[PDB]
Symmetry: D3
Subunit: 149 residues, 6 copies
C-alpha cells in the first residue's frame, strides 16, 4: 500500500546547504529512503527529465539553472507522490502554503529548491532516468508498526 516518488534537490538546495533539512522533513513522516545519490546534472539528462517542455522558451534558462550538483532521491510511503507535492508546495513560492518547503525557503519559481514527480507514471519515468536498478534499496523500517495502520 506504499508507493515511491522521485525527489531531487536542485542546485540551489545544495548551494544554500539545506540538504539535511530537506531530508529531515521527509524522514519526519516515516518515509523511507529507498535511493539517494549526489550527481552533477548535465544538459542531456535534463533535456530528458524536462522532455515535456522541449521547445518552450523557458527551457534553455531552466536547464542552465539546473546544470549543477543535485541530490537524486527516492522516498517510499503511503500516497507519497501526492504527499511530497503537498509538502513541497506550489511551484511559485509566493503561492505556496506556509509550512511547505517552497514557502519556508524560497522566493521565485526558477529557484524553488526541489523537484518531485507529479504522478505515478512520471515517478517511474524519472526514477528510471536518474537511477540504475542496483541503486534502489529494499529494506523495512523498524518503526513500521507505529507508522502504518
Amino acid at each position: 500500500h506504499v508507493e515511491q516518488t522521485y525527489l531531487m534537490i536542485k542546485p540551489d538546495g545544495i548551494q544554500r546547504q539545506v540538504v539535511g533539512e530537506i531530508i529531515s522533513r521527509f524522514e519526519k513522516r516515516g518515509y523511507r529512503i529507498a535511493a539517494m545519490k549526489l550527481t552533477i546534472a548535465t544538459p542531456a539528462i535534463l533535456e530528458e527529465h524536462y522532455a515535456e517542455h522541449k521547445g518552450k522558451p523557458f527551457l534553455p534558462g531552466l536547464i542552465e539553472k539546473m546544470t549543477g550538483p543535485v541530490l537524486c532521491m527516492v522516498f517510499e510511503g503511503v500516497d507519497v507522490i501526492a504527499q511530497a507535492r503537498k509538502m513541497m508546495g506550489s511551484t511559485r513560492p509566493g503561492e505556496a502554503a506556509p509550512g511547505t518547503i517552497r514557502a519556508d525557503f524560497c522566493q521565485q519559481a526558477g529557484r524553488n529548491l526541489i523537484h518531485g514527480s507529479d504522478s505515478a507514471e512520471s515517478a517511474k519515468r524519472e526514477i528510471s532516468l536518474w537511477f540504475k536498478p542496483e541503486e534502489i534499496q529494499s529494506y523495512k523500517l523498524a518503526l513500521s508498526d507505529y507508522i502504518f495502520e
Copy 2:
C-alpha cells in the same frame, strides 16, 4: 477567559520518541501545562475514553492500537480546545495542513500521534477520566502579561 483541554500522546508518539517535540509545540504558544502523566492505556479505560464509539465495528482495532504507553496532558490557554485541534490537524495526516502535527509527522489516521478533546463537554469528561482533581496543578505563567491581552 482561558479553557483547559485534554491532549494525549498515543503509543506511536511515545515509540517514535517525539514527546518533547509535541510538548514544545504547545508551550510555544504560551499554553500552560496543568497536568501531565505517563501511563499505559488499558482496554477498560480506553472503552470509557471512546464511549461514543460503543458498538461500532472499528472500535476493537482502535482499542488495540491505543493499548500501550501514553502521555496524558492538560493544557490551558485561550480557546485552547479548538486551537489544539487546529494544531493537530485533520484526522487523516494526508488531509492535514502543512505545519500541523499530523501533517508533519504522520501518514495514516490509525497512527496519527495524538488525541485532543473535540469540545468543552468532551474536555471536561476526558480530564476527569484520566486525572484526579488533585493531579491538576494551578499556577500562573510568569510571562502572562505578554501572552494575554
Copy 3:
C-alpha cells in the same frame, strides 16, 4: 525586482526572547536584512505609526502595550511586503494558518508578537518613520544567484 518592508518585533517578542527565531524565519527565505535597530518605542512615535487609528477607542491601550522595547527591522526580497504578511499570519492568532508566526507563537491579537507593513505605501511610510536613510544598508547577498531568477 525586490522591495523592502518594515517589520517590528513588539515588546512581547522581546520579553518572550524569540527575536532570533523570528529573524531566522525571514532569513530562511533569502530575505536580506537592510536595517535593524533595538529601541524603546515612545507614545510620540507610536501615535504617528498608528496615525490611521487616531480617535479610535482602542488606540490609547494599543500605544500602552507597545510602549516598551521593540526591534525595528527592514527586510528586502521579491514581493516581501505581501509575503511577510502571509508569514506573520492573520491579526488574530486563532484565525492564523498553522506555520505562520502568529499561529505558532501566540494566542490573542493584542499580543501577536510582530508588526509588518500592510502595503507598499505603508512600507515606505513606516521605514521612513523609524529609520533615517543613513541607517538603511545596501549590500548584495552572496547567494543571490541561487535565490533569484
Copy 4:
C-alpha cells in the same frame, strides 16, 4: 544492563517553557520515559528530597526556590544516571560545558533548570519518594535493536 534515574525539571524550566526541549534531549539518545508527572513541589517533600542538606544554612532558600511546579521524570538507559549528569552539566551553568543543558539555558546555580540523581542509591531513593511503584511504566522501545549493542 540499563539503569533508571530520577530527573526533575525545576520551576524555572516550567516557567521558561522549555519542558519539551529538555525531554527531547533525553529522547534523542534513545532513553526511555518510564515515568512522568507534573506536580507542585511543597516544602515537606522537598525536605525529604534534600535530606542530605539537613541543617545547612542554604537549605531554606533552596526549598523556597524549588517550591513551585515541577516535572518529575524517570528515564531508563545504559549508564543513564552518570550520563544524565553529564548532559545536565556542572551545577554552575558558568562552569558547565557547551552543549549541556545548564550551559545552554542558564546563568546561575540557583536557577539551573533541572535536577538529576547523583548515584544509584540516590536514584532509587528519589524515584521512591516522588513516584509510587504503580506509576513506573514498563515497555520496550521499538528501536531497541538499533540503540543497544
Copy 5:
C-alpha cells in the same frame, strides 16, 4: 551583578544568513538584548576596533574581510563577557569545543562569524565605539525571577 559585553556578527554571519541562530543562542540563556544595530563596517572604524593590531601584517586583510555588513549587539547577563567568549569558542574553529558557535559553524579563524569583547575594559571601549548612548536600552526581563538566583 550583571555586566554587558559587545558582540558583533561579522559579514560571514550576515552573508551565511545565520543571524537569527546566533541571537537565539544568547537569548536562550536569558541574556538581555540591550542594543542592536545593523551597519556596514568601514576601514576607519575597523582600524579603531582593531587598534591593538595596528601595523601587524595580517591587519589589512582582516579589515578587508570585515568591510561589509555587521550586526552590532550588546548583551547583558551574569559574567556575560567571559561567558560569551566561552560560547563563541576558540578563535580558531578547529580548536573550539563542540557546541560553541565557531566549532558548530566555521572552519578558519579569518571567517569565524562573530566578535566578542575580551575584557571589561574592551567592552566599554567597543560599546562606545560602535554605539551612541541613545542606542543602549534599559529595561528588565519579565522572566528575571527564574533566570537570576
Copy 6:
C-alpha cells in the same frame, strides 16, 4: 587547502531516521558534499572496509551489525578528516563530549550511528573502496568567500 573524508551513516542512523540531522551538522560548517550514495552494505565490502580487524573476535558480529542500509558520504573542508572525527565524538558514546554526534544521539559503541575516516591514508582508502571516481563531484560552494580565509 581542503581535504576529503569518508563518512558513513550506519544502519542505526538510517533506521532511527536521523540522516537529515547528521547531514545538517556537516553542512552547518560549510563542508561540501562531494559524494553521497545509499546502499546496502555486504559482508564482502565490509571485510575490506574493516581489513585492519581481520582475525579479531569482534569482527564477525561487527560485520553482522553493519550488514544493512548505509549512507556513504564524502565531505570536503579544511582539516575535515580530523574535524569530522571531533564532531562524531569518542567511539564510546558515554565517553564522547556533549555536542558531538555520538554523545547527543547514542548510548553504546556498537550502535554509534556513524563512521568517519581516522586518517588521511584511511580516508583515501575508504573513499576509493565505496566510491568510483566518477561518483565524486567537483563544484565550488557559492559562499566560499565567507567560509575560507
